[PDB]
Design a protein around this ligand. Sequence first.
Ligand code: HEM
Ligand code: HEM
Ligand SMILES: [Cl-]
Ligand SMILES: [K+]
Ligand SMILES: [K+]
Lengths: 449, 449
Amino acid sequence: SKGKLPPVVSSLIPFVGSGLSFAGGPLQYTTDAYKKYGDIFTMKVFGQRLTFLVGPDAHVPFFSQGDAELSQDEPYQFSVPIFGPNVVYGADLAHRNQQLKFIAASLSTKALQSYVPLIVKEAEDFFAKWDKSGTVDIRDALAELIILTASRCLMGKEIRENLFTEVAKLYQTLDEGLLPISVFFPYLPIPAHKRRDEARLAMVRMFKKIIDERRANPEVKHNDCLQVFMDARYRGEEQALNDEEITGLMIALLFAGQHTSSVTGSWTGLLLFEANNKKKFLPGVLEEQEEIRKEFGDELTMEALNKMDKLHRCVKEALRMYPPLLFVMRKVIKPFSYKDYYVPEGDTVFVSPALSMRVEEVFPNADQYNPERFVEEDKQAQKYRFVGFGAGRHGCMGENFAYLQIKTIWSVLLRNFDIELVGELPKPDYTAMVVGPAHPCLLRYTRKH
Amino acid sequence: KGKLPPVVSSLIPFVGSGLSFAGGPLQYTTDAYKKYGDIFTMKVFGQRLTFLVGPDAHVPFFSQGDAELSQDEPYQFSVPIFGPNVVYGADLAHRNQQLKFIAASLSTKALQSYVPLIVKEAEDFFAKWDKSGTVDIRDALAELIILTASRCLMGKEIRENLFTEVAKLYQTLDEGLLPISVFFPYLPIPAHKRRDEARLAMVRMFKKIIDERRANPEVKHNDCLQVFMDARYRGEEQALNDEEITGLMIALLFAGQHTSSVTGSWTGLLLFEANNKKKFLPGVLEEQEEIRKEFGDELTMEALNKMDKLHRCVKEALRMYPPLLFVMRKVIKPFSYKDYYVPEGDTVFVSPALSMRVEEVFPNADQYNPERFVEEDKQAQKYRFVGFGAGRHGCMGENFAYLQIKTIWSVLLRNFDIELVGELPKPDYTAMVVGPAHPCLLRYTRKHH
Ligand code: HEM
Ligand code: HEM
Ligand SMILES: [Cl-]
Ligand SMILES: [K+]
Ligand SMILES: [K+]
């Protein structure tokens, strides 16, 4: 008599946990919860339980288990239309695990040995272009260098040299496709998603061409991830990876490595040149650069980079204080116990590298910049204290690439310019999934004789 | 089979205001409209979101009142922006009175006094421009609209002495409105917090001005602040306190700034697109010639009120690109619409965007045709055009917005030849108010003979 209900279009209940990456940086809030309730606690949002694990002990059930006990599928569902069909989190475990091993081959110690001269030259040529003096937003600059370097190392000479502007524009459109809504409704047909999908298709076409040329000229042999991906084969399967899968592995490596590396490289300098940090730590860093030039010569090689321990510790301490990924997460498949507690099937568990690395019993004076704290850590064997790169079975495969990229950046900058922080240390910017220093992150450079 | 860790918080927020940050799901909603008709429901986390499309279905939305349809839940995000006991943070008794105060500040009478101030600001602003150049019209109109509002809303003292400081505080409040802020307005993240501190500082700024004006009560001030200082609640001798007065000003900045500047930007971006220019510019310029013939050169209220063809150019930008994609209400009392029933607890939506592309209302709705409004304005059926809403909570600033925007374009059209650089921009859906995506470039040349 009153009437019937209108038609219901759909009834959606998305996974809420991925939303924490777009919550505006609730570190103080979650830290207050940790100080009051201890190292394991739960928030419920829309009835979904989100269970946080803070510090090295609580880290264990998160990093020590594997794919049978903890799932990455829901947390990374956002990435499926970004990387493409049947790539990584859009692949079944059988195929995904193989793809992760192809990626591991491309980022192996051996692969890095061949990339380092390319990374070094891309850096030297980049900073050559700079005037006798000036100012720079390093977050913007390093983002430019790091996409340049990755086009060379990952995508190969043909793209880097001919099609760089084209490929950086495509990557940029993909990236602009990842919005807060995107982690709930990855297939929502909004304009930024439509533009993401077009860009992915355009990247597959660009790589089809290169792959096809290299197939038709198989004598040649090439120094890059693309080559590794063209030579990969799944167990029991005659065929190479198709064009969509190879391109998808490349987009995955850019999403994993571009903003993470550029922001950490940005914080490393922003923190080192802040006036009081600079007085205490810049002397050791410059001195080390002098001793290394003495022992290994002036050219920058893998061997010299591997001994820049003080520089290494400046990067690492930037990462400890300002980790680019505030949360990592998993859906609980098999319940577990931690101290007197049970964590049920269906919870989403979290580790915050930001929270866990401000724990005062782990890292004394957690809020002070002290790169030399790592001298003592190097003696420690307790697992999961430093977790900026994650850990265990899905720990960062790019960690050594990132350290080489960042140390190469700051070795070339330190050798060629004298540097000062304009203004106060930036604050973090919580606008995107990857957290970086707020614009402006201005530095002053003058060339040094 | 065990003990659950501490649950520190369980929350089920209102999901409806999330639509404003969903990246512009116009085609999604349009497709639903086409499949299911003029009333349909989407459920998200079990919350029913019911959409009403076109003039018949708009009737329940715009004709009902506060006992039937509530603004409270939808606008709860605004309470810590505007401050305690202001607008959507006040009870109805006081809220209705505050809207009556706002209405007094925006009446024909008050606008007569504002028009010479608006005109002076625009004329001076564009008088600073070079002989020729390019400009981002969105950035430029945003700057002029905030200057102008500082003078008309806030008074000569603030405009002439404290412009920079108030604009910064306003910018900080704007930066505190994030997607997460519409679900959790009191979440203690750094942007909320900076927001809270900026609001307090604006109250301190206004306390000084209000105290000085009260100490010199014989000085006449023409601005919204004087209207709010003279306001009284029925049965209370005491004036509005300083937080309330500041709150009303902040609400008027949030209501009026981005809406007016994006609509001002689209007005020219559309009019000067090559094809639209060929067709509609000659009549617009012809009109400006006749107005100068009849009224001379002064931009008076009366002359602006005769600019019908320009008025229609604004109205048509607004029709095609409305700055608020959705308006919404929580259903307090169930209602019938034709054969349907809408239950208590639904959130009802009207999209100005979707409704003004309804082809039986607006033929060739995708085409720019300002002169459609010669026939449309003769239509008697209610709620065909809803860019400024309608009914009880319909836009109070409409006439101010049209005065501001027509003043802008009267100054620009008389002094410059203008062209669109490149393609018409696409809408940018990254903020609650939608505008043309940057770059929004116009090339200008000063007129000569
Ligand atoms: C400072 C820079 C970087 C940081 C802070 C960082 C951080 C992380 C973190 C926290 C994870 C853990 C994800 C999880 O458990 O769910 C991870 C995984 C990964 N990272 Fe990075 N990363 C960085 C640079 C890079 C670079 C440069 C690359 C590639 C070129 C890369 C490739 C990967 C890959 C492939 C994984 C997945 C590992 C697996 O599932 O087996 N990362 N990274
Ligand atoms: C082109 C410019 C503008 C557009 C398109 C616009 C549109 C709208 C819309 C759609 C609403 C309805 C909100 C709802 O349904 O709940 C609204 C409300 C309002 N607008 Fe505007 N507006 C504009 C400019 C302004 C300006 C310049 C001011 C003030 C200076 C203003 C003040 C208001 C106020 C106070 C309300 C709330 C009215 C009430 O609750 O009674 N608007 N506007
Ligand atoms: Cl969807
Ligand atoms: K365990
Ligand atoms: K200019």
